Amino acid sequence: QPVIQDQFTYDEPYVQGHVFNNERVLVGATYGSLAIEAFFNLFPEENSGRISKLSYISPIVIKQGETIELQAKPLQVIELQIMYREPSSGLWKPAAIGQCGIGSFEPKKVNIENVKHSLTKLHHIDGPEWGELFKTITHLYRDHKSILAKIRLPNGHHYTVSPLMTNSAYLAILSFLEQFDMTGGFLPFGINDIQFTKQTIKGDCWLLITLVKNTGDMLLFDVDVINESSETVLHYSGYSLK
Numbered sequence: 001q002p003v004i005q006d007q008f009t010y011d012e013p014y015v016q017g018h019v020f021n022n023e024r025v026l027v028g029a030t031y032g033s034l035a036i037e038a039f040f041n042l043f044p045e046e047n048s049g050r051i052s053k054l055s056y057i058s059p060i061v062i063k064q065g066e067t068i069e070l071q072a073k074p075l076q077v078i079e080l081q082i083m084y085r086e087p088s089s090g091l092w093k094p095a096a097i098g099q100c101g102i103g104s105f106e107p108k109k110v111n112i113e114n115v116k117h118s119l120t121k122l123h124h125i126d127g128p129e130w131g132e133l134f135k136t137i138t139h140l141y142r143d144h145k146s147i148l149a150k151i152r153l154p155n156g157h158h159y160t161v162s163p164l165m166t167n168s169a170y171l172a173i174l175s176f177l178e179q180f181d182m183t184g185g186f187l188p189f190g191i192n193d194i195q196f197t198k199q200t201i202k203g204d205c206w207l208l209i210t211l212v213k214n215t216g217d218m219l220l221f222d223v224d225v226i227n228e229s230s231e232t233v234l235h236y237s238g239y240s241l242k
Contacts, residue, residue: 004037004072006030010062012155017131026060026068027134028188029167031096033159035080036196038072039100040160048105048197051080054098055190060084070095077101096190105197108232110224112148112206119143122175127185136168138204140175147176149207161196161234169223169239172207177219177241189218192238201225201233209239218242 008015008026018027032054039049062068069085071092082096119141139150149172153164170188177186206226213220223236 001041004034004041005070006034006157007067007069008060008062009067010064013131013133014155014157015062017133019129020059020127023061024063026062026095027163027167028056028059029163029165029170030070031056031082031098032166032191032194033161033163034070034072034082035096035098035100036161036194037159038074038080040198042074042078042100043102046102047199048103048195050101050103051191051194051196052099052101053190053192054096054194056096056188057094060095063087074100098190103195105195105235108224108235109230110206110208110226110232111230112208112226115148115208116141119146119148130171134164134167134171136164137171137175140172142176142179144179146208146210147172149175149209150204151207152204153202160198160200162201165201165225165234166191166236169207169209169221169225169236170241172209173221173239173241176209176211186219186241189240189242191236191240192220193236195235195237197233199233201227204228205233212238 035051066087073081077099080098083092084095086093122140136151141148151168208224210222219241221239224232225234
C-alpha cells in the first residue's frame, strides 16, 4: 500500500495559524496524528492501539511558496519515523520518532461536574501566534495542579485523531501554566504514551489535564479526553513541555 503521507503548504490556514520566532512552524500536534494513522495502516482489524515514546526531533519551518511533504514510515518493537522532505536539499529528514503497539483501550469514568466543582472557572478565555482554526477552547477550570477544558472540534487533512485534539491539550496546558511566574515560553517535546481507538472523536468534549512531573526543566502532564457522557475516549500520558 502507499505509505501514510500528507503535505502542508505555506498559505493554508493550518500553517498560517501557527507562528513562532517569526516563522510558520508546523505544529508539533501533527506528529502524533500521523503516528496513529501509521498504526491503523499497519493494523487494520485493530480498533484501538498505543503510541509510545513519541519524541519531536526537529521543528519544520515552511517558507513562502513552499510545500512540505511528510511521510510516516514504520520500521523493525515497531518504530515509527515521521520524515519530512527538506525543500532545500530534497532530502528526507526526521521530524519525529516513536513506537506503536497493539493495546486495548479501557475507558475510565469521569464525573465532569464533580471535577468542575473543585476548580476555579476562568474568564476571558482569549510566544506562539495562533490562527482561528486552533482556537478550540470554550471553557477552562483550573487549580494549582490541574486544568479542565471544554473544547469544540470542527482542508483535506483527514485524521482519525485530529491534530486539533492534541494541540488543544497544549493550549490548555499553557492556560494552566499562566498562573505561575514563569517568564519565558515553553515548547512541546513529545508524548510518552497515547492510548486511542478508531472511533473518531468529534464535537464537544473535555480535557482533564494533570501535572505529574516537574524536573530537569521538563514539565510532564497526563491528559484524559472525556465525552459528553462521562467516559474517557483517548488518553495521553507524559505529555512533555520544555
